[PDB]
Structures are given as C-alpha cells and as structure tokens.
Amino acid sequence: SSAYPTIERTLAGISGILTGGGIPNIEVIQTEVFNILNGRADQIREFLNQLDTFTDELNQQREEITRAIDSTNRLLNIVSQRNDTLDRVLTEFPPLI
Amino acid sequence: TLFETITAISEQVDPIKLNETLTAAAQALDGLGDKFGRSIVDGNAILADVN
Amino acid sequence: NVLSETVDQTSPHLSAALDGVARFSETIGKRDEDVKKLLASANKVATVLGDR
Amino acid sequence: RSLEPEKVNTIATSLITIFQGQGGTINDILDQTAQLTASLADRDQAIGE
Amino acid sequence: GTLLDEAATAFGGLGPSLQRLVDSTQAIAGDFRANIDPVNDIIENSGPIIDS
Amino acid sequence: ATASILNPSLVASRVIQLSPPYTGGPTLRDGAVLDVDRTQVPIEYDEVRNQVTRLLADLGPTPEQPKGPFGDIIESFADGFAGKGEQLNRTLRGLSDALTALNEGRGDFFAVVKSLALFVNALHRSDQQFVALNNDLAQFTNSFTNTDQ
C-alpha cells in the first residue's frame, strides 16, 4: 500500500529546495561566468593550446629541474654552513677595498 | 505520475549541500569574472611570448 | 553535450593531476612566511646588484 | 531571473567554442602537469632546505 | 545525489579560499604580462653568462 | 509613464496600470499618446504552452540520446568526479595558499625580475671576457703557488 504525492507535498518539496538551497547565488555565478567568456572564447581556446605546449615543454625538463634543485641545495648548504666566514668577509673586506 | 517523478527528483537534492556548494561558488567568482577572463588573455600573451 | 564529452574524456587523467598539484602546492604553501621573507631579502640584494 | 536568454546563449556558444575537440589537449595538460608536479614534489625536502 | 555530495565535499567552505585563489591568479597574471620584457631579457641573457 | 495591461489572476478582468508612480516632475498631460515602445501586454497562456512544449522537445530525450542533455551531463559529472571530492578540496586549498603567498610577495618578486633583467642586460655580452678572466685569474694565482711555501 502506498500513496501518490499530493500537489501540496510536491510544491512543498520544491519550495524547500528553492528557499533553503541558495538559489539567489546562481544568477550571481552566471553573471560572473558571463564576464569570463564574453568575447574571449577563441582566446581561451588558444590559451588552452598554448598551456598544453608550455606544460609539455616544462615536463620534458623535469630531470634537469630536479638536478638543478639538487645542485642548488648542495651549494646553498655549503654556503649556509660557511655563513660565519661570509659575515666575517662582509664585515672586514669592504673597508679594505 | 508527474508529482511522483518530481518528488523523486526533489528528495535527491539537499538544500543544505546545494546551498553550501552554491555559496562557495558565488564567493569564488563574486566580482572577479572579468578579472579572471582578462587574466586568461594575459596568460595567453605570456605563453605566446614564453613558448 | 560538449561538457559531458569533455568530462568523460578528461576524468581518468584528473586524479593524478590533482594529487601532483596538491603536493607541489603544499610544498610552498606550508612555507609562506619563509617564501615571503626570501622574496623580500632577494628584492633587497637584487636591487643592489641591478643598480650596480 | 537567472535564465536571461542573452547570458545563457553567450555562455553556451562560448563553451562550445572553448571545449570542442579539446579533450585530448586537456588530457595532455593533465598528464604533463601531473608528471611535472609529482617530480617537483618528490624534492620537497630539497626545496625546503 | 552522488554529484551533489561530491560537490559539497569539494566546495564545503572554500568560499574565501577560492576567492583568494582567483584574485591572486588574476593579479599575478596581470603583473607578469606587465613585466614580460624583463622576463624575456632574463630568459635570453641568462644563458651566456651562466655557460661562460 | 508606461501603460501595461495586466491579467491579475487565472480568471479576472484585465486592467491597464500606469507602472511608475508619480513622485514629482512633469506630469502626463491630457490628450497624450503612448506608442508601442512604452506599453506592455500580458504573457498569455498559449505562449506559455508553446514555450513549455518547445523547451521539452528541444532539450529532452531523443532516440539517439535516451537520457537527454541534462541527464547525460548529470551522469557524466557524477561518474567523472566520484571519489575526487577530497582530492579536489585538497588541491584547491593548496593552490589558494601557494598563490596567496606568491601574490603577497608579488611586488618583491617582480622587483627581483626587473633587477636581474638589468643585471643580465649589462653582463651578457662579455661572456668570452668572463672566461678569459677566470683563466687569467687561475694563471695569476698559479704564478705564486708553484711550491708549497
């Protein structure tokens, strides 16, 4: 045994969705979307293509970027552990020069 | 049948989760859509000069 | 239809991109103060170098 | 009020223009950026140091 | 229902955070375009000195 | 003023309402003529039926697309983002934090860029000079370290 939803119950569910669902936000969102895409669809498509190119070319250099990170890390560690000598130089050499 | 179908659809939509999702999206884009599109154009120019 | 096709095609390759972007963004995001201090000191030193 | 025909039509045409046949391009973007960012994040300690 | 749950999980309280993300993205992109000549100069002229 | 014809309810007597209430200024004089540009008419019921039928036929299910465009987009977005809510949330938070940190130091970063630009623009041409300088420095220091003491 069951009962079909009444028109009152159906409209009450719809009204609950409408009043408790943040509907006034939607138009705002749409407005902002309209501002993103207004006269720029071709430019956004070509930006997607250029982003594909740029990301591929960067990904082709991931090993070199990793090696540069390691090399810079080693050099900066050595200089950080010689920071004392660095400070002594920066204090005593400029007057001599 | 129409009322039953609308009721079945409406039980699925939750005002609480829909409200928070739409609130996040509206706060995300509020006042920045034109800026975001101009930034996409600027990034297009930057990539055209960098690639 | 176009949005449906795009989401169908790009879905299997999205989780790995999300994970990688999240990890690399959190690499810098948990060092915000250090990064900003680094940028300020680099601004000072690089300005000194460029002026001379 | 959110169903204004001008905004709906403009958004629809712009989405068609942007995303038509760009599934492969976006897939390549996702794959390349995933690999690059994973490689960069594997050096998290090195970047911090 | 599943899509709404996933959207709520992904966009729970990210309002201010996504707003900051979009504002930062647009500001950085605009400033980067404004200084594209120094970036091009660095990219072109860094190689000779470093390889020297 | 705008004279708009109104249908108050389902079964009613249609009226003509002068839409903007008077708040001062020039007034509508006797014998005035209002053209089609400043008049409005009700929506009518056959127009509502026609538009409902048109939208339900154009944006509804078809033999080639049994679920309809909205059913297909709902299904695709539900299947393609299933289980990625937490991943997307984490990615968005990390991106926002990192880009906010970069944006706060954006002015310093681009000052660095402009300064390194001047540096490289002034030093890039004399690269062979730098190689020669390194070699000459090595030779000059070798000139005084031929023995231990």
φ and ψ at residue F40, rounded to 5 degrees = -135, 155
Q: Which positions ≥6 away from F8 have C-beta within 8 Å?
A: F14, F15
For chain A, how far is it from start to end, CA to CA, in angstroms? 101
Tokens linked to A5: 């939803």
- Please tell me the total number of residues recorded for chain B in this structure: 51
List all residues 6 or more positions away from F102 whose beta carbon is below 8 Å from its beta carbon: C28, C35, E24, E28, F109
Sign of the torsion formed by the C-alpha atoms of F62, F65, F66 and F67? negative
Answer whether D45's CB lies under 8 Å from C25's CB: no
Residues within 8 A of D (CB atoms), C 1-52 only:
2-3, 5-6, 9-10, 13-14, 16-17, 19-21, 23-24, 26-28, 31
Pick from B13, B23, B36: CB nearest E4: B13
Count how many pairs of residues, chain B against chain E, have C-beta atoms within 8 Å: 79
By the 8 A CB rule, do F113 and E35 touch?
Answer: yes
The experimental method, as deposited, was cryo-EM
Q: B10 touching E, CB under 8 A?
A: no
What residue has token string 């001062």?
Answer: F24
- The resolution, in angstroms to one decimal, equals 2.7
The amino acid that residue C44 corresponds to is K
| Residues A77/D49, Cβ–Cβ less than 8 Å | yes
F108, C40 Cβ separation under 8 angstroms: yes
SS (H, E, C) chain F: CCEEEECCCCCCCCEEEECCCCCCCCCCCCCCCCCHHHEECCCCHHHHHHHHHHHHHHCCCCCCCCCHHHHHHHHHHHHHCCCCHHHHHHHHHHHHHHHHHHHHCHHHHHHHHHHHHHHHHHHCCCHHHHHHHHHHHHHHHHCCCCCCC
Chains C and E lie in contact, requiring 3 or more CB pairs less than 8 Å apart: no
Using an 8 Å CB-CB cutoff, list chain A residues near D7: 30-31, 33-34
d(CA D31, CA A46): 19
Q: Name beta bridge partners: C35.
A: none
Q: What region, left, alpha or beta, does residue B30 occupy, with left being phi > 0 and alpha being psi -120 to 50 degrees?
A: beta
* Assigned token pair, E25: 């993205």
Report residue A26 as tokens.
């939607």
